[PDB]
Design an enzyme around this catalytic site. Sequence first.
Site, PDB file in Angstrom:
ATOM      1  N   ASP A  66      67.850 104.950   1.201  1.00  0.00           N
ATOM      2  CA  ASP A  66      67.965 106.423   1.429  1.00  0.00           C
ATOM      3  C   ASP A  66      67.902 106.559   2.921  1.00  0.00           C
ATOM      4  O   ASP A  66      66.740 106.590   3.492  1.00  0.00           O
ATOM      5  CB  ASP A  66      66.621 107.184   0.811  1.00  0.00           C
ATOM      6  CG  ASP A  66      66.652 108.524   1.227  1.00  0.00           C
ATOM      7  OD1 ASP A  66      67.686 109.286   1.759  1.00  0.00           O
ATOM      8  OD2 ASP A  66      65.594 109.280   0.833  1.00  0.00           O
TER       9      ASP A  66
ATOM     10  N   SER B 275      79.930 116.468  13.601  1.00  0.00           N
ATOM     11  CA  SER B 275      81.196 116.384  13.235  1.00  0.00           C
ATOM     12  C   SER B 275      82.152 117.341  14.138  1.00  0.00           C
ATOM     13  O   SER B 275      81.555 118.262  14.312  1.00  0.00           O
ATOM     14  CB  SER B 275      81.247 116.517  11.741  1.00  0.00           C
ATOM     15  OG  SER B 275      82.810 116.575  11.357  1.00  0.00           O
TER      16      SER B 275
END
EC number: 3.4.23.22
Length: 330
Positions: free
Chosen positions: A35, A199
Amino acid sequence: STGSATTTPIDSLDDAYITPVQIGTPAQTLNLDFDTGSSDLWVFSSETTASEVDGQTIYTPSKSTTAKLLSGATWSISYGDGSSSSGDVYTDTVSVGGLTVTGQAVESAKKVSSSFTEDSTIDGLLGLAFSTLNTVSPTQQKTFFDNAKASLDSPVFTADLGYHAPGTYNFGFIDTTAYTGSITYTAVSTKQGFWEWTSTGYAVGSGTFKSTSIDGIADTGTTLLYLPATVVSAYWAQVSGAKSSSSVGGYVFPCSATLPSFTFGVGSARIVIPGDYIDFGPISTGSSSCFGGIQSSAGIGINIFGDVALKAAFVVFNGATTPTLGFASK
């Protein structure tokens, strides 16, 4: 040193991925959920409340000659989906894909919430976010990656998750045969303890690319792609009959649909998520309403590039002095 381990979807939907991990002496092999959105290595154990164990493999520290109680240490964690676990702490030898750390904090669960109990395939979590998020008190502990880093050939690990197929976590090296083209690297902020990056925009299907900054985290421990409501609405508007359902808990779409792809930007590069990756199947057995793999982050407080996005790429988690993230197509 290096390590290399195969990671395998837990079910036919790729709800999560499990990777075998050797703990203790002699080795006890547990299948852990790696994770990159948390920083605790915790396991089902001989200390876990018996009624909360249902099919998981447990770690038994009394059977390990290298286990030592970390006296006075406790831990307690809550995750974004509302699940939780807590317990006490041992140190022991932990190996992943041939890479060994001695003295790793292994957090032994005394209690786990129902979602963990119900998932018989996940024996615990191995956190790979920054150690500043680790929950052990009163002495915070380091992640497996942080402990291994100085011994690694290169201070990196890579995630290469498969779509309905096994993939690979590598430590200490970049497998240049595992991706196509070049890797594009992008800046990371560690301010919130995550692999947080920005992004450069998105496209829906064959549509034009929208240049827009989207701050989010690379999180292998989250199934879906959670993005701003504007972006998510633009995506689902291209699917006939798709709608947001408060009763279901997000966007659903007719199971008869063919889903468009979704592209996200990494610098000037583009990663394309095929439409099929965005299908999470019937909302309940036999339903013709299907759950979407792109959902709104509104009310989460952060955008999450979870498995839906990451499995479309070869992803480098660069833990050099100035960390960065790399993405390549594959």
